[PDB]
Amino acid sequence: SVTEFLKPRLVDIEQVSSTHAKVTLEPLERGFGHTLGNALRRILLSSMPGCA
Amino acid sequence: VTEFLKPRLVDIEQVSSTHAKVTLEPLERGFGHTLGNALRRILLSSMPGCAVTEVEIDGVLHEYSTKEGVQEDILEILLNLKGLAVRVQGKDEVILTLNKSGIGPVTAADITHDGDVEIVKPQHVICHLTDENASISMRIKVQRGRGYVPASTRIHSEEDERPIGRLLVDACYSPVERIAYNVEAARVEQRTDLDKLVIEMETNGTIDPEEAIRRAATILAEQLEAFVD
Amino acid sequence: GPEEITADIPNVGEAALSKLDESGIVYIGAEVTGGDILVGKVTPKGETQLTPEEKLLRAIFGEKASDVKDSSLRVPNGVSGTVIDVQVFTRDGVEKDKR
Amino acid sequence: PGVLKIVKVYLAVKRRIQPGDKMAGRHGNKGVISKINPIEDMPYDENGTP
């Protein structure tokens, strides 16, 4: 993996209700979990298309 | 997509041989800086680079000493050679042999230069000896690594081996170690405003800026693939 | 009998002797991991009678006789690393000078 | 007289920092090493200097 490590396998997501949920990921690489989480947050916030 | 305006890497100017300034086409904000940061992380993280793995020097066998004509210590010579940089062929674990004698200045030319090994600074200092009778001759195995490792990390792997004479050291194995991700809003006139990104890579010369960038991006995409699941 | 460093530690692992130089001491610059034994002094131990059981033990294994208590120098706990050099001082009247 | 000979063996040990170290400064200021993250976590400068 040339430091490719691996990808979080376990992707269990716990949804308390239809309006609130929590998701957990398996082991991602050092900094990889954090960098990916920040990137996904910035994307899903800075870009979330829909109708309203 | 909705007029995604997919960018493209362009105007890739190699500022140096171990550095480059590569731009790309405009893209929507809120991710471009994030894309650059993620790319810098992945390339910095999964940085497979050719480094020095094991060493063997005739005069200096075990740990730390001084020999007539010698200048820098065993670890000091270790750093001095580490002062030079190594780029390997597709097969790693190459073995270099630095052997020389005389009174001239120390340069990287006087090493075992083969097809699987590239030497950049042929003016790297190796603590030129002061005695004509002194004759440096050290054979070192150089491997490609992806990340840093303790020197004690490889203790169990060679219990009987790595005896007095055989040398092993810690490493960082970060091919780039210098890359900044700057996002600037530019290069979008016809469509919606988008950010033009310029990447200033600075590596050790083991990998090309474009190839390493592509590798890091592929790794990032592969990781994002798991996010679907 | 004095504790002489000759790596002749009774009931000593082969690797333990594999590091000590013939002088009981070890080679120089050699690195020690864990509690490695460096200089094996042979402190004399007490003797016994015929002890036909111990006579048979000597006839089988032998070479120990419970006569040399092991005064070997082994590395301290939590101590492991490179031995830069060593120093040996012998009193007047003793000049083995192995190393 | 007790020892007909004496042998001193010298071993030298290297040392890198570890978690919880003791930083010092002639400005009196004292510091205890807390944590080191990936250089990604360090904020980037204008020149990108983390």
From Swiss-Prot, chain A:
Signal sequence: where? none
Please outline how this chain is modified post-translation: (Microbial infection) ADP-ribosylated on both alpha subunits by the phage T4 protein ModA. ADP-ribosylated on only one of the alpha subunits by the phage T4 protein Alt.
Q: Where are the transmembrane segments?
A: none
Which top-rank group of organisms is this from?
Bacteria
* Record note on quaternary structure: Homodimer. The RNAP catalytic core consists of 2 alpha, 1 beta, 1 beta' and 1 omega subunit. When a sigma factor is associated with the core the holoenzyme is formed, which can initiate transcription. Both the N- and C-terminus interact with different regions of transcriptional regulator CRP. The rRNA transcription and antitermination complex (rrnTAC) consists of RNAP, NusA, NusB, NusE (rpsJ), NusG, SubB, ribosomal protein S4, DNA and precursor rRNA; S4 is more flexible than other subunits.
What this chain does, per the record? Answer: DNA-dependent RNA polymerase (RNAP) catalyzes the transcription of DNA into RNA using the four ribonucleoside triphosphates as substrates. This subunit plays an important role in subunit assembly since its dimerization is the first step in the sequential assembly of subunits to form the holoenzyme.
What does the comment on domains in this protein's record state? Answer: The N-terminal domain is essential for RNAP assembly and basal transcription, whereas the C-terminal domain is involved in interaction with transcriptional regulators (such as CRP) and with upstream promoter elements.
Family label: Belongs to the RNA polymerase alpha chain family.
What this protein is called in its record is DNA-directed RNA polymerase subunit alpha
Which species expresses this protein natively?
Escherichia coli (strain K12)
Name of the encoding gene: rpoA
Parent-record interval covered:
4 to 55 of 329
UniProtKB/Swiss-Prot annotation, chain C:
Briefly state the modifications made to the protein after translation: Acetylated on several lysine residues in the presence of glucose.
Q: How is it used?
A: Co-administration of salinamide and rifampicin or salinamide and myxopyronin suppresses the emergence of resistance to both antibiotics.
Q: List the disulfide bonds.
A: none
User: Which family, according to the similarity comment?
Assistant: Belongs to the RNA polymerase beta chain family.
| Subunit composition and interactions | The RNAP catalytic core consists of 2 alpha, 1 beta, 1 beta' and 1 omega subunit. When a sigma factor is associated with the core the holoenzyme is formed, which can initiate transcription. The rRNA transcription and antitermination complex (rrnTAC) consists of RNAP, NusA, NusB, NusE (rpsJ), NusG, SubB, ribosomal protein S4, DNA and precursor rRNA; S4 is more flexible than other subunits. In pull-down experiments interacts with CedA.
Q: What does this protein do?
A: DNA-dependent RNA polymerase (RNAP) catalyzes the transcription of DNA into RNA using the four ribonucleoside triphosphates as substrates.
What name is this protein filed under? DNA-directed RNA polymerase subunit beta
Q: Which gene encodes it?
A: rpoB
Q: Please state which portion of the whole protein this structure contains, as first and last residue out of the total length.
A: 846 to 944 of 1342
